[PDB]
Amino acid sequence: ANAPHGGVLKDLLARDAPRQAELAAEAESLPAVTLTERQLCDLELIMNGGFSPLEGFMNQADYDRVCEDNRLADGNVFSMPITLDASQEVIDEKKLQAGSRITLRDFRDDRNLAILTIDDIYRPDKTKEAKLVFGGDPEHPAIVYLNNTVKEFYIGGKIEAVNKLNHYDYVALRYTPAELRVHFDKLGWSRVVAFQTRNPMHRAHRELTVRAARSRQANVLIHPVVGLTKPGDIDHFTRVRAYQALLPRYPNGMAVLGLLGLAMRMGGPREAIWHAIIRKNHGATHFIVGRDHAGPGSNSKGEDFYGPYDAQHAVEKYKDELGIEVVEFQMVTYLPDTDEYRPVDQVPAGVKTLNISGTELRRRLRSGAHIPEWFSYPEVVKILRESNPPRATQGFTIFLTGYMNSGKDAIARALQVTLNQQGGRSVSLLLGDTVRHELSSELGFTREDRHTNIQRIAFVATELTRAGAAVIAAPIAPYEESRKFARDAVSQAGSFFLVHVATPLEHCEQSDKRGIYAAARRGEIKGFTGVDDPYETPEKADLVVDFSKQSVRSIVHEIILVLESQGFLERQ
Amino acid sequence: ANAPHGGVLKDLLARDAPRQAELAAEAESLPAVTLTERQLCDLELIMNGGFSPLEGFMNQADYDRVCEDNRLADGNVFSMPITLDASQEVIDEKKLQAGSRITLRDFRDDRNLAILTIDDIYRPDKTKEAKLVFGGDPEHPAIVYLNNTVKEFYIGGKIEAVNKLNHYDYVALRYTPAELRVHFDKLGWSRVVAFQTRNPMHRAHRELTVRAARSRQANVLIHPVVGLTKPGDIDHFTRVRAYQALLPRYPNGMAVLGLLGLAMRMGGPREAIWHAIIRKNHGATHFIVGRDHAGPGSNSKGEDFYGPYDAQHAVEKYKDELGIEVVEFQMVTYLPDTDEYRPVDQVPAGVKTLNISGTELRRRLRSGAHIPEWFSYPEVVKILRESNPPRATQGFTIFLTGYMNSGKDAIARALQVTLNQQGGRSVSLLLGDTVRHELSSELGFTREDRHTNIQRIAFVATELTRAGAAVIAAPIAPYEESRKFARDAVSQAGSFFLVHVATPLEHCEQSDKRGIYAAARRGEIKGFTGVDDPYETPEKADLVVDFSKQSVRSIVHEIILVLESQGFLERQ
Amino acid sequence: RVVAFQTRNPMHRAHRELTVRAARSRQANVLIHPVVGLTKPGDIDHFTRVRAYQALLPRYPNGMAVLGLLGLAMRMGGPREAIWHAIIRKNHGATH
Ligand SMILES: Nc1ncnc2c1ncn2[C@@H]1O[C@H](COP(=O)(O)OS(=O)(=O)O)[C@@H](O)[C@H]1O
Ligand SMILES: Nc1ncnc2c1ncn2[C@@H]1O[C@H](COP(=O)(O)OS(=O)(=O)O)[C@@H](O)[C@H]1O
C-alpha cells in the first residue's frame, strides 16, 4: 500500500462506528433528503475515505478552489467538483439553512445513510463549471447532466456516517479503501499498479497490465468502475463477468479484481488526476493512464472533447503533489507478423498493425461475425455475445398507427401469425382493443388519456423487447407526441419500427361493420378520432401502407422484408 | 382419390362462386354473428366439403340423430355434433328466429364469410350430449368446453358461401378437399393412406406410415390437425416445422404433407368415425387408426376416458358404411436387439422393448437430457427443444405479497440485482408503486379496482414469462382471488412463485418513514390496507418470509435456493 | 406481383441476394424458375441442381419464394433468348 491523499484516510464509517446507535436515532428525527444515484456514488466514496481528504459534499470555499484551481481550500490537489444539489422547493419545504442537520437517505431501500451539517447553500455558475471543469462542449455528458439533472443549488457540508450503503451485487468483490489495504496486506503485496476501466478488457489491456507489472515490479489491481459510466456502455454485470473470465490469463496470484463504486464524469484530464487520488486512497502505489483516459470520445460535429494523451500531461503537471506513480502508455496495438502487442511508439512505421474499433466490434456482435483471438480472449467474447446478441435474436417492436378500422388490426394479427411461422421468437400481440381492455380499461379519450395509454403500451413493449420478443402493437395513436415517446422508450431496449396504416378515413368509415363511426356521426360518441378528435399524421414512419390499395398479405410481406433487410430474420 | 361421403362433395364455396358479388352485398345487410375459433374451424370444413354431406350447422333433426344414433337425418353416418351456439341475449338483440338470414363473421379480420338460413333455434340437453357423445366424464376436454364455453342454444341451418377464411400461415400446405383431390391427380396417385395427428411425429410414426404404404400399396398423406387440438399440446407451428423435418426420411415422392383446419374434440371412438369421413371427403382411399386414436388420455382419478383400440372397434362397427379402408395398428415399439419397430402383438413374450413415454420426453426436454435417436430423428428433437426449453432458459415470475412497507419492495430490488448477477435472462422489475404509476395510474383502492390492477400485472407478467424473462412483481395483492388469477395466467406460460412477505403489521407501521400509515390512522386516507381495507392472508404460498426475523439478503437467498432446486439456475 | 428468376446453374449466395433485392424493390414474391429441359452442353445435371435449389429455399423468409421447374430447351441465344424468356415467364404469370 501507500499513504492516503492528505495523510489521513477519511474513513467516516470507521470514525463514527462507535456512535452508530446514537447517530441512527438522531437521524430518524431530522429532515431527510433522498439522494439521486450519482449523489449516492459520491456519498459512498466520501464516507469510506475514497475521496480523502474530502469528508463531505463540497462547500463553496472548497468548490471554488476546484472549479478553478484544482485544489481544495486546504491546498491539496483535487480536480473534480463533488457537490450535493437541491432545488429551491426542497430548501424551503425542509427549511434548510446554514448549521442545519439533514439526513441523507438511500432511495433504493430507504435506509438512513449519513447526517450532513450544512456549511452553506450556494447557487453555482453552471456555465463556469461546464467550461472550467469539463471543457465547454454542451454535448459533453457531464455538462448535459449539469444542466438537465443537477438542480439549482449546491448544499456544502461535512458528513457523519450512519450506515454503509447496501449492495446486493458482487459483495465479495467490492472493497473499501480500508478493506483493500487490509487485503494487499493479507496478500503480502507492497507495490500495486491499479488499472481503471469502464469497458470489457481485451487482449491489449491484459498486455498493458502485465507490462506495467513487469516494469514497475508490481502486482495488478484490476479496479473497474461499477457505479456510473459513459451513457451507453456495456452494463456492469456483463463487464464484471468479462473481467472474471480474464483473470485466469494472468499467472497465478498476480492480479486481484476489486470493484469501485465511482460515478465517472468522463472529465478526461481532470478525471484522471481525480482517479490517481482515488487509487492512492485505496492503497495502490502506481496507476495507469493510457490513451484517452476518462475521455468520452468526440462530439456531433466530430470534434473530440480532449486530445489523446492530454490526461497524461495533466496528471504530469502534478507529478510532485500526487503521491502515486503514474505509468503511461501510448495506444497499444497488435503486430500480426510477430504476433505481439506494443505501444505504437515501437512499431517501425513500416510494420503491419491490426486493430478492431468500437464500431467494428458492435458490427460483428450485431451480425454474429467472428471476432479474432488476437483481439480478445474467447471466454470474453462469449460473454459479450450473450449480452449484445445478433439481430437474429434481438427483440423488436412493430408499432402500427392509423384510423380506427384502417386495417391495422387485421394487419397486426396476420403479422403475428406470419412471425410465428417464421419462428425465431415469442410474439406478443397488443391490438388496440386488447390494450384498452387489458391495460387501459379505465382511461378515456382526452389528449392526456390517450397519451397515457400509449405510454403504457411503450412500457410493456420495452420490457418485452428487452427479453427478445417480437412485439406487435396497433393502437390508433393519434398524437405524434405519444408515438415519439413510444419510440424513445423501446429504442432503449431494441429496434422500434413505425408502420403508418394510412388507409383513408372515407374507406375506414364506409367499411365499419360495427356502426361505431355511425354512432360518432350521430353524436352518440363524443370526440371520436377522425370525426371530432384529430389524427396527427405521421411525418417520418419507417413504412407507409394502405389497406385501400394493398392487401393484408402484401402489407405483411412489406413489413417482413424490412425486418429481413436489417438481419432480424437471419438464422440463430 | 375416392368418392365423397354421401356421393356429393358439399363444396359450398365452389357452388356459390358465381353468386359471390351478390351474396357479399346481401351479407352487408343482415344482422351478423361473430364466430368463435372453434366455430370458425367447423365453418371452414363445412363450406369446403370436408364435412360432406353436411352443409350447414346442424339443426335439431340432424343433431338428435347424431346425439344418439351416429347418423344424420338422411341416414348417412356422422358421429360428431357440429353446431353453432348462441346465448339468449344474442338471439333477442339480433331478433333471430326461424327463416332468418344471419351473416357469419371472422373475428380475426372482420370478413363476412357465409350467410346461414335458420331452420330452428333449440336448447340442447348438455348432459345427454356430454354423456352420449363424449363418454360422460366432467374432466373430458369436450365436456368442459360444452359447459364453460358453448352457449345455451344451438342455431341450425344451411349455409351459403360468401368468402373462404383467410390464413396467413402455411398457405401452400393448406388444402381444400377439392385442391387435395386435384393434387393427388397431378401427382398421379390412386391409393392414398392418410395419417391423422396432433403431435410431433417420431420414429414410430414414420414406421406406421411406411408400413401402411407398403401393405396397402399406397402413397402417404401426412394430414395433421392445425385448427384446435388437446388443451396443452405443442403449438401447430412447431409441429408443422417438425413434420417438415421428417419428410426427407421417406423415399423421394412417397409422402405429401397437407394441413387440416380441424377443431378436434378428443372424442376418441366417435372422433375416429368422424375422421374417416373427413379424410374420405379429402380423397383418401385409406385411413390409419392406431392405439388411442383421438383420445385425451386419463382423468384425474387416473381412469382413462376410452380404452386403447376402442376407436378401432367403433370405426369397425361401420366398416360397410364408411367408404374408406381403415388401416389398424397396435402400439408400435422399438426392439433394441434387432433395431426395428413393430406392433406389440407381434412381439414374443421373450423380447425386450424400448419406449420413451410422454412424461419421460417432457422430463428430458425440461432438463436438457439426451433423447435417443432410435426414438426420434435429430432434426425433430432439435425443433422440440427450441419450443420447450430446459428450466435453465424458461422464464418465471416471482410474485410478492405483503402489507405496504413489509419489506417486499426492498426484497424485490435485491432479488433483481441478484438475478442480474446470476446472469441467465432479462429481469423485469414491477414494484407495487411502479405498476401503479406505469400501468394503473387511474385505478383506486376498491376491491374491484385492486383486483383489476393485479390482473394487469398478471397480463404483463405472462407475456414476459413467455419470452423467457424473470419477472419480479411486488404489489400488496390483498385478496386471494386476484392472486390465484395471477397464478393461473402466468402458469399458462411458465412457472409462478408466490412469496408471502409475512412481516407483521405492527412492524410495518412502526417503520413507515413516509407517514402514510400515519395519515391512514388519522383518516386522511380511506380504506388503507391493514387500517381499513382487509388483507386476505395467503394460505398456500411457495415461500413465507418475515422482514422482522430475516434480512433482505437471506430472504433473497431463500428464494434463490428455490429457483435452484427446480433447475432454473442450471447452465444454458 | 411475382419476379421470376431464370437459371441453369446451382444458385449461390450472390443469386439469393439478387432475388431478395428484386423482391424488396419491386415489392414482389419470388419464383425461382429453373430450366430442367435442355441447357448448355456441360452444366450440372438438373437433378443435382434441383436438389441445390431445394437446399436454398430455407434461406428466404418463410413463404417468400416458390420453386417451379420449367421444361424449356435453352438455345443459349443471349439477347434473343432473353426476349423469349420474358415472354415465357409472362405466359406463366410472372409480373416481373
Ligand atoms: N488500446 C489502448 N492502449 C493504451 N491505453 C489504453 C488502450 N485502451 C484503453 N487504454 C487505457 O486503459 C484504461 C482503459 O480505459 P477504458 O475502460 O477504455 O475507458 S476509461 O474511461 O476508463 O479510460 C484507461 O487508462 C485508458 O486510457
Ligand atoms: N373517442 C374515441 N376515439 C377513438 N376510438 C374510440 C373512442 N371511444 C372509443 N373508441 C374505441 O376504442 C378503441 C380506440 O382505442 P385506442 O387505439 O387505444 O386509441 S388511442 O387514441 O388511445 O390510440 C377502438 O375500439 C375504438 O373503437
Ligand SMILES: Nc1ncnc2c1ncn2[C@@H]1O[C@H](COP(=O)(O)OS(=O)(=O)O)[C@@H](O)[C@H]1O
Ligand atoms: N405408438 C403408436 N403406434 C401406433 N399408432 C399410434 C401410436 N401413437 C399414435 N398412434 C396413432 O397415430 C395417429 C397419431 O396419434 P396422435 O397424433 O398422438 O393422437 S391423435 O389424437 O391425433 O390420434 C392416431 O391414429 C394414433 O392413434
Ligand SMILES: Nc1ncnc2c1ncn2[C@@H]1O[C@H](COP(=O)(O)OS(=O)(=O)O)[C@@H](O)[C@H]1O
Ligand atoms: N387505500 C390504500 N391501501 C393501500 N395502499 C394504498 C392505498 N392508497 C394508496 N396506497 C399506496 O399505493 C401502494 C399500494 O398499492 P398496490 O400495492 O398497487 O395495491 S394493490 O392492492 O392494488 O396491490 C403503496 O404506495 C400505498 O402507499
